Amino acid sequence: YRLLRQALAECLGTLILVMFGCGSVAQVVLSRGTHGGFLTINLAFGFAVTLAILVAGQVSGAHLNPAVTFAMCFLAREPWIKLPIYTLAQTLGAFLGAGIVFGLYYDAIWAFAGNELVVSGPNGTAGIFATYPSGHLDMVNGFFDQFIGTAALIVCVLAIVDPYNNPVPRGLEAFTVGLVVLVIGTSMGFNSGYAVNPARDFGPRLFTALAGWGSEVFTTGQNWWWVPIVSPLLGSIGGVFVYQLMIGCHLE
């Protein structure tokens, strides 16, 4: 089964970036403003994407993003049956990567607020794994940020992949995709890292429900959990239209 081989590569790729990325957030969150700021969170996530792509680049294409996989299906570059397989493989591996981080910081997480796990607040530990609405990050505000963030990510990715353009040698394509993740995190109002990945958000959030935080991770922030899963999907369609009209449809 050729499809089975590519699912394993996608599962391992998302495991690397989530474990390396969410682990960096834990150091900043748990050690309050001592072991780093926001630049280290965005730098770690950006570099972890480069390593994740390099590990699984030659097997499954190194999408590691349901929005990226959706865009390729929308452009008929890949079969439509590769979306359910990749999405399942990408979510399983962000769940496993988040489980590793919980094992490493088990003692510090439980002692953040005494002996009780708090989903949201001043001493909130659930923000290590999944994004949450801040003071100026309402659903109407949050939906716009992820739409623009994913649209810019798709535009840059489609430029490198484009067969009409000269084939970029292997090695420099991975760094370019990791550069978009770093710039997007610095620009858009999201201090969690790689906020435009549906699989990086649902997986760790699903783990947080069974880790001990309860079901309040799904019924808080005015049911915010579905926003980082639907809006990134829409931005992938917009990014395809933006790129094709300006550049793609006229290349030869």
Q: Which of residues 86-115 bind a second copy (CB under 8 A)?
A: 100, 103-105, 107-108, 111
**What is the distance between the alpha carbons of residues 250 and 245, in angstroms, rounded to a whole number?**
8
Residues 6+ positions from 44 with CB-CB distance below 8 Å = 20, 21, 23, 24, 193
Instruction: List the x/- string, 210-249, binding to a second copy by CB under 8 A.
Output: --------------------------------xx-xxx-x
Q: How many CA atoms lie within 13 A of 20 on its CB side?
A: 17
| Of residues 171 and 215, the one with the C-beta less far from a second copy | 171
- Per CB under 8 A, the list member of 3, 39, 81, 230 interacting with a second copy is 39
Q: Which stretch binds a second copy (CB under 8 A): 8-16, 68-76, 80-88, 228-236?
A: 8-16
By CB under 8 A, is residue 123 in contact with a second copy? no
Q: How far apart are CA 150 and CA 235, in angstroms?
A: 5
Site string for a second copy, 48-87 (x = CB under 8 A): x-xx--xxx-xx----------------------------
Nearer to a second copy, 168 or 209 (CB): 168
| Cα 227 to Cα 206: distance, rounded to the nearest angstrom | 15
Distance CA 71, CA 11 (A): 19
